[PDB]
Amino acid sequence: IVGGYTCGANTVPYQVSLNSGYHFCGGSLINSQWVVSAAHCYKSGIQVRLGEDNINVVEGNEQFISASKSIVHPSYNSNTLNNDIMLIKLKSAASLNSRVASISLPTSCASAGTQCLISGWGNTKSSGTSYPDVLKCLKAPILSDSSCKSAYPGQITSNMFCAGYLEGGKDSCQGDSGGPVVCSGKLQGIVSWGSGCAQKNKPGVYTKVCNYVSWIKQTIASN
Numbered sequence: 001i002v003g004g005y006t007c008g009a010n011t012v013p014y015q016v017s018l019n020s021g022y023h024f025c026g027g028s029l030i031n032s033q034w035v036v037s038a039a040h041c042y043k044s045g046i047q048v049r050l051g052e053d054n055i056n057v058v059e060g061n062e063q064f065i066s067a068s069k070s071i072v073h074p075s076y077n078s079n080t081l082n083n084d085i086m087l088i089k090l091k092s093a094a095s096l097n098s099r100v101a102s103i104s105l106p107t108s109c110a111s112a113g114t115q116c117l118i119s120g121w122g123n124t125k126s127s128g129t130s131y132p133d134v135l136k137c138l139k140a141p142i143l144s145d146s147s148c149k150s151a152y153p154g155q156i157t158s159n160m161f162c163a164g165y166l167e168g169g170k171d172s173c174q175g176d177s178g179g180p181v182v183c184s185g186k187l188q189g190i191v192s193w194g195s196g197c198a199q200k201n202k203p204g205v206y207t208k209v210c211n212y213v214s215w216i217k218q219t220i221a222s223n
């Protein structure tokens with residue numbers, strides 16, 4: 001997250017870190033045994049880390065649970081990033097509490113202008129690299145489809161939305177992928193892609209979760 005703020009420990013209780021020896025992506029806990037992330041975060045050997053603030057220090061609220069299975073969306077295209085969503089099942093259910101909690105799926109899609117909370121452990125620099133170790137947060141509005149498509153001609157599908165600031169300075173970045181965009185208490189987006197980080201006229205692009213609620217619910221019900 002570039003241009004954000006330190007969230008505070010366990011203030012984003014649905015935020016998970018995906019670890020394969022190291023943090024490589026975020027995710028969102030949607031019930032005691034399932035996480036939503038980005039399809040481009042897929043790999044084998046995932047351990048889901050819940051209750052994290054500093055990802056390099058055991059602080060006492062963590063739960064570390066290996067994945068039993070991952071399900072990448074059937075229509076994910078890794079060249080276009082269309083349908084950049086996957087589900088990860090935990091081998092055992094997380095213990096839910098104030099600091100480890102699920103986030104609700106949306107009832108309807110959120111509108112341009114709606115404020116959202118974006119979070120992650122990704123790079124905090126637009127030029128060069130610095131990783132923060134504690135969770136970073138950014139409040140950002142959803143941008144209109146028109147301005148998203150004008151920023152990224154030929155790239156924005158019906159399964160994507162932009163959020164952030166056309167002036168730059170505030171955005172998600174490398175290492176935030178797969179993490180949440182929460183608006184009005186519902187998971188509306190997944191950190192997906194952008195051209196650089198926090199650059200003018202290149203806002204972040206997010207998977208449009210409301211298009212996937214039926215797939216998520218049906219997949220969970222049978223897996």
Ligand SMILES: NC1=NCc2ccccc21
Nearest residue numbers: 172173174193194196204
């Ligand atoms: N918003 C983003 N710009 C670059 C990037 C990489 C990975 C995830 C999100 C972004």
Ligand SMILES: [Ca+2]
Nearest residue numbers: 054057058059
């Ligand atoms: Ca920790």
